[PDB]
Design a protein around this ligand. Structure first.
Ligand SMILES: Cc1cn([C@H]2C[C@H](O)[C@@H](COP(=O)(O)OP(=O)(O)OP(=O)(O)O)O2)c(=O)[nH]c1=O
Ligand SMILES: [Mg+2]
Length: 218
């Protein structure tokens, strides 16, 4: 019933360096949303890396099981069509694909190309905007079938309202039944999350709910 657990986790990127994560604690039940916030260098991406097994803890316990889909904070494209970039070697299903591109507002973009979903990216032709590349990268991660979705600041280059709309249509509605960790700073995302973890220089600045944090004000 619990999907991801960290208990008293401390970790280092360099032996004898300073810890990148210090005494971190959280729990996510199946289907819940954890928001992970904090300033640059706080350890948010490192926390995701530990879940993906690229960073081993020096102290503490970690629990998680199953396939992971990871959306990097650095959007990327490979040579191929926009459809191929989103499916990215996963089996194709029209309904699933269309649901994702609609939730990511990409249907609007794609409808304007004569080649539609067969427009070729990453081969010197179309030069995508930063917001387009971010929404394609998010769609790629969301299309993949996984037990756990790790979305590392996926709303790069998007204006406030577009970010809000895609957070609601993709992360909250399309992915409503999925276990999600979303690295984000935005107030509405923290308010909608089941739990919030705010990191500061590796430490747990706050862990709880948005309501609990409100109760602390005053
Ligand atoms: C991800 C990563 C971080 N680090 C170091 C860099 C930092 O000193 C520290 C924490 O880095 P990050 O985990 O990358 O911090 P962040 O993701 O919260 O920052 P941002 O909002 O800008 O994305 O770990 C490594 O040494 N190797 C790595 O692969
Ligand atoms: Mg990061």
């Amino acid at each position: 019933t619990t999907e991801v657990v960290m208990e008293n986790v401390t970790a280092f990127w360099e032996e004898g360096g300073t810890p990148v994560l210090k005494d971190i604690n959280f729990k996510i039940e199946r289907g819940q949303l954890l928001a992970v916030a904090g300033s640059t260098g706080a350890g948010k991406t490192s926390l995701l890396m530990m879940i993906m097994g690229e960073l081993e803890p020096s102290e503490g316990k970690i629990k998680h099981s199953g396939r992971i889909s990871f959306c990097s904070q650095f959007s990327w494209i490979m040579p191929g069509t926009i459809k191929e970039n989103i499916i990215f070697g996963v089996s194709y299903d029209e309904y699933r694909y269309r649901s994702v591109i609609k939730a990511c507002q990409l249907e609007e973009d794609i409808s304007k190309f004569a080649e539609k979903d067969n427009i070729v990216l990453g081969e010197g032709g179309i030069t995508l905007s930063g917001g387009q590349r971010a929404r394609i990268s998010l769609a790629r991660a969301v299309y993949k079938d996984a037990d756990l979705y790790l979305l590392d600041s996926p709303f790069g280059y998007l204006d406030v309202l577009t970010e809000k709309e895609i957070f609601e249509s993709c992360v909250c509605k399309l992915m409503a039944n999925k276990t999600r960790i979303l690295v984000t700073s935005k107030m509405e995302h923290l308010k909608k999350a089941d739990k919030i973890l705010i990191l500061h220089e590796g430490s747990s600045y706050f862990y709880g709910t948005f309501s609990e944090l409100q109760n602390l004000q005053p």
